[PDB]
Amino acid sequence: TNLCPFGEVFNATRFASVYAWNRKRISNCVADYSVLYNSASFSTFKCYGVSPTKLNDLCFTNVYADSFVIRGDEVRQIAPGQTGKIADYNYKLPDDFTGCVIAWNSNNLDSKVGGNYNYLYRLFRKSNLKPFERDISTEIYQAGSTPCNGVEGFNCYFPLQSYGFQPTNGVGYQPYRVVVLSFELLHAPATVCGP
Amino acid sequence: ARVDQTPQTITKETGESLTINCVLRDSNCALASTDWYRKKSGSTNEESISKGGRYVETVNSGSKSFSLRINDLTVEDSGTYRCNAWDSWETRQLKCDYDVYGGGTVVTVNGP
Amino acid sequence: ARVDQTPRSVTKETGESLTINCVLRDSNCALSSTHWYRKKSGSTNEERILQGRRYVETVNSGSKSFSLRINDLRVEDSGTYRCKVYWGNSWQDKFCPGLGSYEYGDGTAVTVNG
Ligand SMILES: *[C@@H]1O[C@H](CO)[C@@H](O[C@@H]2O[C@H](CO)[C@@H](O)[C@H](O)[C@H]2NC(C)=O)[C@H](O)[C@H]1NC(C)=O
């Protein structure tokens, strides 16, 4: 068949905020992974339930490509069993995760002089996000005892918070683009194979 | 798969505020991510607006609506503004890879 | 689950030595190996730090600690050094990354004044 369009995900002109992370299905194609793996552009290449050195020899019933922007200090949270503001409220991998987590520093693209405040993340939620769930709502978080009638104020916070991405930031606060590939293997003919 | 932008033409003076509203309609997906583009008056390209300072964006997911409020209007604010609602999310049945723009709002701020 | 590389910056005069350290913090997973890469000041491609008379690569496996020491500093060594740790196959552990997974250190900008 034909090669899987990994480029339109990795090389997308614009990325989404982690709370509104993107998802593209990869299907009916040949997937070349050692092109990604044997690269010098990725800061983190961690796969779970499968070794990256064996990806080109395996087929999968379905492959999902999820992409978002976070800060480097929070890349550790994109992993099974991890907890934190992002894993609990923004993007949660399951404990039984089979796939790869790929991240790279995007300071040259997502940082403005004086700060880029366009990428947001969810800071408040009632319950922790289920695995692979995405929360889009923007309703006022009922923080304290007194309820909120869609008004921001005391004990009534806006659930989303912006990053401040500046070139002069330390690497912990520089923006990182993350692509997570989740692999699914059912008792059905596989749609994505390596060469 | 199209966002409606209102109003089409508003004029203000230096000082005061203005608000451009936008509602995403004719779609089964929620309002995920947004952007605002500005074309300066005697310009030929559109610039991505940086939110959080003078440009305040309010997003309401329940009404699939989002607005942009601009304050401290200077004469350099004269131009056209456009919404942009986009998302790339895919599930078993609900799919939405859309990237839609608004009709535009020509603003004219007068001098001091 | 994080490579803590130190120092982030170092400046030394030509002739003395320096040591770069990067350790894995809060990990229970086996590590296979760790490589060292240098991006010269003004370049954009990294070079693998191969065998060298002035290069010393030390591993404390049980410590998850890796160090690089450069003796007889010269201006040709000025640049940014990164360590690249490779994970081994930690058997019967879901939360560990597979064999061959890697992570780069944050980097170390070294300046050598002539
Ligand atoms: C994303 O784009 C990059 C750059 O356009 C692709 O990698 C480059 O591929 C070209 C073609 O051989 C080379 O000139 C560069 O040396 C490559 N750079 C790197 C860092 O590999 C990359 O393949 C694209 N992403 C995907 C997923 O295909």
Residue numbers in the entry:
A (entry chain C): 333 to 527
B (entry chain B): 1 to 112
C (entry chain A): 1 to 114
Structure paper excerpt:
The variable binding domains of these antibodies, VNARs, are the smallest known natural nanobodies.
We determined the crystal structure of SARS-CoV-2 WA-1 RBD in complex with ShAb01 and ShAb02 VNARs at a resolution of 2.5 Å by X-ray crystallography. ShAb01 binds to the RBD with a total buried surface area (BSA) of 888.5 Å2 primarily engaging the CDR3 loop (728.5 Å2) and the first β-sheet recognizing one side of the SARS-CoV-2 RBD, reminiscent of CR3022 binding and distal from the ACE2 binding site. Within the CDR3 loop, a β-sheet (G100-E104) forms an anti-parallel interaction with an RBD β-sheet (S375-S379), and the CDR3 tip (Y86-G100) interacts with multiple loops of the RBD including Y369-A372, F374-T385, A411-Q414, and D427-F429. In addition, the N-terminal residues of ShAb01 bind to a pocket located between RBD residues D405-A411 and β-sheet S375-Y380 thus increasing the overall ShAb01-RBD interaction. ShAb02 binds to the opposite face of the SARS-CoV-2 RBD in relation to the ShAb01 epitope. The major contact region between ShAb02 and RBD is facilitated through four negatively charged residues of the ShAb02 CDR3 loop. Notably, the SARS-CoV-2 RBD R346 forms a hydrogen bond with ShAb02 Y101, a salt bridge with ShAb02 D99, and pi-pi interactions with ShAb02 W86. RBD residues N354 and K356 insert into a structural groove formed by two ShAb02 CDR3 β-sheets to create extensive buried surface interaction.
